[PDB]
């Protein structure tokens, strides 16, 4: 059993995360955890299903919100829904007062976003109650449907994620294959090449992150150079939801088979993973 309240514009800050979810994933999986863990996970059948992991701590944006299930062998609990129902249910509460969220019983166990609103017309009460239709996933599935992984090939800060985007919509007209190039000199190249037309794009003047090891200087070395690798209109998916240009934007190409993205903007960090062939 599980129950929460939201009260502020934290509310809207929660609302635009859920549409920030509905818009890049059709059937996310949500984990209420102990008092500070709220993530959204994407993979039902569909093979990998890319992989989106999105932690947002409930720590800050909530008055009271409690947690405990007759959960086997742990206290973190997972449950999964059609992403709409969270979002639809949510974008009618960005207007004022409150919103309770909790699991139901019979009538087909579900997520139940109770949502209160102001009734200016003298002293009335007005309440909505939306029932998302959800599945608590099995004991075992927990282990095997995890997203986090620490991976270091080539990292770089991203341009305007909406100027970048203004491009992909046009590229997807011309080809379905996309090649990603990044650099040690803030360079970035969006690349289509079909037989009738070849279209490429050069995103100069960026940055690059530095990590370190256990030593007494800057760090170790390798023997690497520039970094290519191909993809699809999956890039265009993660891009369409980024309507508030992330406060930190990242793209770590991994050795010609991964593409990582590390978005964190204000409190809500969001991670997105595109694979490389066809």
């Amino acid at each position: 059993f599980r129950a929460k309240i939201v009260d502020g514009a934290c509310l809207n800050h929660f609302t635009r995360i859920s549409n920030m979810i509905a818009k890049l994933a059709k059937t996310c999986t949500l984990r209420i955890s102990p008092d500070k863990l709220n993530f959204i996970l994407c993979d039902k059948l569909a093979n990998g299903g890319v992989s989106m992991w999105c932690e947002l701590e409930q720590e800050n944006f909530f008055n009271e919100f409690q947690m405990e299930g007759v959960s086997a062998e742990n206290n973190e609990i997972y449950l999964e829904l059609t992403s709409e129902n969270l979002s639809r249910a949510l974008k009618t509460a960005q207007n004022a007062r409150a919103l309770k969220i909790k699991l139901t019983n019979k009538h087909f166990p579900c997520l139940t976003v109770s949502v209160e609103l102001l009734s200016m017309s003298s002293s009335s009460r007005i309440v909505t109650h939306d029932i998302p239709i959800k599945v608590i996933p099995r004991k075992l599935w927990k282990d095997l449907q995890e997203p986090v992984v620490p991976d270091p090939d080539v990292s770089i800060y991203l341009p305007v994620l909406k100027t970048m985007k203004s491009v992909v919509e046009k590229m997807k007209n011309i080809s379905n294959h996309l090649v990603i190039e990044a650099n040690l000199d803030g360079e970035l190249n969006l690349k289509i090449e079909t037989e009738l037309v070849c279209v490429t794009t050069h995103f100069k003047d960026l940055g690059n992150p530095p990590l370190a090891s256990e030593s007494t200087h800057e760090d170790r070395n390798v023997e690497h150079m520039a970094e290519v690798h191909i993809d699809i209109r999956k890039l265009l998916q993660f891009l369409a939801g980024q309507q508030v240009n992330p406060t930190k934007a990242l793209c770590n190409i991994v050795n010609n088979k991964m593409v990582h993205f590390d978005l964190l903007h204000e409190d809500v960090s969001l991670q997105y993973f595109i694979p490389a062939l066809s």
């Binding site: 203004s166 279209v199 794009t201």
Partner: protein, 264 residues
């Protein structure tokens, strides 16, 4: 360098739009003379659509031999000179383009807007010379300028059926008539002279002609965000020469729909 053609712009949007304003068929023939570029859309043998940008609008224009001509994906071209921008600002969009002997047609574009500048490199190829199609410049009968505003407003009723133009006979006050004929619905638009600013009429003999509306359709829609000349010939046929007065940041721009059928 050494090339059929080279052209730099500082504002792509001048080629972009006027180009955009004739884009219905998949491809186009852009014959480039030493005077500018005229790109032409040829529908089904009853509709030319022309589009002539003179070089004086290109901030730099150069052409080796009087023949520079070719076909290109009009769709996939236009898609490139708007690679990133439905929404500009005080920031601008630049175009530069370099063609030669009969293999490759590349384009160079950068955009600058509040923090970084972005070069994008395009290369669209060239197919056949196709079947040249040349219409009429014989004689005019009645000529008629109308307004940018009012006549797009009038196009409001989407009829999808048939077209008839009309131009009346009187000592002073004429009339100019549109009319559609669809499933239960004849509908008539006609403009009298009052408040004609550059909206001048030359009705000189009485005349009424017929157009299939299936061809002229893209014309009005896609091109007439600006004001036109309606001129009906009667020399080698009876046919419509809409040619619209378009323009960006003050320049001699024009495109040109000749059209000519009866019924069907």
């Amino acid at each position: 360098d050494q090339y059929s053609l080279v052209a730099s712009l500082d504002n792509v949007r001048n080629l972009s739009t006027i180009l955009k304003a004739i884009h219905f068929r998949e491809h186009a023939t852009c014959f480039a003379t030493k005077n500018g570029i005229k790109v032409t859309v040829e529908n089904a043998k009853c509709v030319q659509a022309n589009a002539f940008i003179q070089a004086g609008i290109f901030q730099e224009f150069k052409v080796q031999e009087e023949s520079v001509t070719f076909r290109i994906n009009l769709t996939v071209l236009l898609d490139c000179l708007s690679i990133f921008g439905s929404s500009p600002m005080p920031g601008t969009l630049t175009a530069l383009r370099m063609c030669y002997q009969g293999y490759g047609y590349p384009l160079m574009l950068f955009l600058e807007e509040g923090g970084v500048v972005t070069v994008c490199k395009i290369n669209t190829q060239e197919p056949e010379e196709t079947l040249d199609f040349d219409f009429c410049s014989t004689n005019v009968i009645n000529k008629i300028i109308l307004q940018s505003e009012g006549l797009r407003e009038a196009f409001s009723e989407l009829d999808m059926t048939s077209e008839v133009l009309q131009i009346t006979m009187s000592p002073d006050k004429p009339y100019f008539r549109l009319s559609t004929f669809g499933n239960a619905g004849s509908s008539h638009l006609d403009y009298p002279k009052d408040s004609d600013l550059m909206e001048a009429f030359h009705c000189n003999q009485t005349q009424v002609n017929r157009y299939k509306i299936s061809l002229l359709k893209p014309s009005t829609k896609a091109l007439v965000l600006s004001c036109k000349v309606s001129i009906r010939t009667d020399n080698r046929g009876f046919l419509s020469l809409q040619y619209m007065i378009r323009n960006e940041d003050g320049q001699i721009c024009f495109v040109e729909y000749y059209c000519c059928p009866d019924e069907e």
